[PDB]
Write a protein that holds these residues in place. Sequence first.
Motif, PDB file in Angstrom:
ATOM      1  N   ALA A 422       0.920  -1.280  -0.218  1.00  0.00           N
ATOM      2  CA  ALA A 422       0.442   0.082   0.220  1.00  0.00           C
ATOM      3  C   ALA A 422       1.250   1.322  -0.124  1.00  0.00           C
ATOM      4  O   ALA A 422       0.662   2.192  -0.777  1.00  0.00           O
ATOM      5  N   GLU A 423       2.091   1.442   0.179  1.00  0.00           N
ATOM      6  CA  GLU A 423       2.910   2.562   1.023  1.00  0.00           C
ATOM      7  C   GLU A 423       3.379   2.444  -0.554  1.00  0.00           C
ATOM      8  O   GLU A 423       3.783   3.951  -1.233  1.00  0.00           O
ATOM      9  N   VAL A 424       4.565   1.049  -1.452  1.00  0.00           N
ATOM     10  CA  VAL A 424       4.920   1.598  -2.501  1.00  0.00           C
ATOM     11  C   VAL A 424       3.731   2.342  -3.930  1.00  0.00           C
ATOM     12  O   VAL A 424       4.535   2.767  -4.716  1.00  0.00           O
ATOM     13  N   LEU A 425       2.617   1.470  -3.254  1.00  0.00           N
ATOM     14  CA  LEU A 425       1.520   1.876  -4.458  1.00  0.00           C
ATOM     15  C   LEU A 425       0.986   3.126  -4.188  1.00  0.00           C
ATOM     16  O   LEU A 425       0.931   3.826  -5.143  1.00  0.00           O
ATOM     17  N   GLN A 426       0.992   3.739  -3.492  1.00  0.00           N
ATOM     18  CA  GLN A 426       0.316   5.734  -2.519  1.00  0.00           C
ATOM     19  C   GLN A 426       2.160   6.009  -3.496  1.00  0.00           C
ATOM     20  O   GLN A 426       1.392   7.369  -4.065  1.00  0.00           O
ATOM     21  N   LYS A 427       3.266   5.748  -3.162  1.00  0.00           N
ATOM     22  CA  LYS A 427       4.234   6.588  -3.620  1.00  0.00           C
ATOM     23  C   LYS A 427       4.256   6.307  -5.035  1.00  0.00           C
ATOM     24  O   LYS A 427       4.531   7.282  -5.770  1.00  0.00           O
ATOM     25  N   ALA A 428       4.245   5.310  -6.114  1.00  0.00           N
ATOM     26  CA  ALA A 428       3.547   5.544  -7.262  1.00  0.00           C
ATOM     27  C   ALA A 428       3.256   6.199  -7.958  1.00  0.00           C
ATOM     28  O   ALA A 428       3.156   6.496  -9.175  1.00  0.00           O
TER      29      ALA A 428
END
Length: 438
Positions: A422-428
Motif C-alpha cells: 500500500a505504501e509502495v503503491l501510494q508512492k508510485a
Amino acid sequence: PQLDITRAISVGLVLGAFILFAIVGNILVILSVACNRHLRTPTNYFIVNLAMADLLLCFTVLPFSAALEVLGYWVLGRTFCDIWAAMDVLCCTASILSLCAISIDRYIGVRYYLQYPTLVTRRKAILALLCVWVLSTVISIGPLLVWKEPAPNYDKVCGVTEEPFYALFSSLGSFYIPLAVILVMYCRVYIVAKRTTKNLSFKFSREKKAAKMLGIVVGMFILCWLPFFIALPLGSLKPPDAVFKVLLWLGYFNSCLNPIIYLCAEDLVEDWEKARKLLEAARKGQDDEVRILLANGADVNTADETGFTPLHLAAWEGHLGIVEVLLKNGADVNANDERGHTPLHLAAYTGHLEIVEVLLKNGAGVNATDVIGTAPLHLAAMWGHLEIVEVLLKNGADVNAQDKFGKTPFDLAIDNGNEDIAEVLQKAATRELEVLFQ
Ligand SMILES: COc1cc2nc(N3CCN(C(=O)c4ccco4)[C@H]4CCCC[C@H]43)nc(N)c2cc1OC
C-alpha cells in the motif's frame, strides 16, 4: 408467397457473410503476410495468390453477376458477356493452377522434411506464381481469340453452353488436367504423411501440419467447382440455364471459404493427444517431456477448452524452465483465456517473481486487463507479492487501474492488510510530482 420476405434476410445474411470473408477476410490474409517478414514463406506466397484470385473475382466477375440480377437483361454479349466469361475462367484457372503449385510444394515439403527449406525459396516461389498467371491468361483469353466471329443459326455468347470443341478443350485445360496433377500429388502426399507418421526434427509436423490445412482448401475448391465442370462436358452428350446459374454461384462461394478455413481448422492442434500432452507437461513442471513434445511437433499456442495455453499453466504453476523454452519456441506471451487473463496475470497471482520478470522481458502487457478490469498489479497487490508489485511498477504498471467493482490495486492491498505494498503503491501514484524533485 409469404416466404419471399424471409428468403431476402436468409440470402442477405449468407451474401453478407460471403462479402465479409471474400473481400475483408482475403485482404486481411494478404496484409498479414505482406506486413510480416517472418510470414513471407513459399506456402504463404501461394495463399496470397489464392486470396488475390478470390479478390479479383469479387471486383471483376460478381459486379457482372450483380448487374444481371439487379437490372435484368442488359446482357450485351459483344462486350459485356465476353469480359465476365473471360474474367470468370481467368480467376478459376489461376486458383486451380495455384493449388497445383501447392500440391507439389506439399509433396516436396512432407517427403523431404529437412531438405525443403533450401530447395524452395522466395525466388523459386515467385517463378511458380509467375507461371500460373502466364498459363491462366492463355487458357482463359485463348478461346476469346480462337472463336472471334459470332456463330450463325445458334450463337450463345450470353450462355455457359457451347459446342463440344469448347466444352471439352476449356474444361480440360481449366479443371480436369490441373485436377489430375492435384489428386495424384495429394494422393502421393497422403501416403508419405502416414508412412513417416507411422515411422515417427519437428520439420515433418510443421509441413504435414501445413499439408493438412491446405488439403482442406484443395478439397473445398474441388467440392465447389466439380458440379459446374462435371455439367459442361456432360451437357454435350442437359442442364437448364437456371441450373448453370446456381452451379456457378456454388463455384464463386469458394472465394469466402479460404479465410474461414484458416480460422476454423485445428491441425497444428490436430493431435488432440499430443496437444493435451503438452498442456499437462507444462503444468506438471516436466522440462524433459515438454522439450521432447515441442520437438516432436506439439503446438506451443495450444488452446485449452477454458482458454489456458501451456505458457499460462507454466506461469501459474511456477515452472520457470518451461516458461523460457515455450517463449524460446515462439509462445504468445500475451495469450488470453475466456475472461482475458494472460500468463502475467497468473504469474502475478501465484507470486513467481522469476516468471513475471521473464514474461515482461519477452514483452508481456504490463497493464493487460481481464473482463473484470483486473490487471496483474491488482493480483500481486492483493496477495502480499511486494517484489512483483515493485517489478510491475518498474515496467510502468498503472496504479489508477480500476476493476468493475471500482477496486484499485492499492485498495486490494489495504483490504488484505498489506501495509508494505500500500505504501509502495501510494508512492508510485505521486510519480508525476517527482518532475519537481531534481
Ligand atoms: C469457372 O469456369 C468457367 C466459367 C464460365 N463462366 C461463364 N459465364 C459466367 C456467367 N454465366 C452465367 O451466369 C450463366 C447462367 C446461365 C448460363 O450462363 C455465363 C452466361 C453469361 C455470360 C458469361 C457466362 N462462361 C463460361 N464460358 C465459363 C467457362 C468456364 O470454364 C470453362
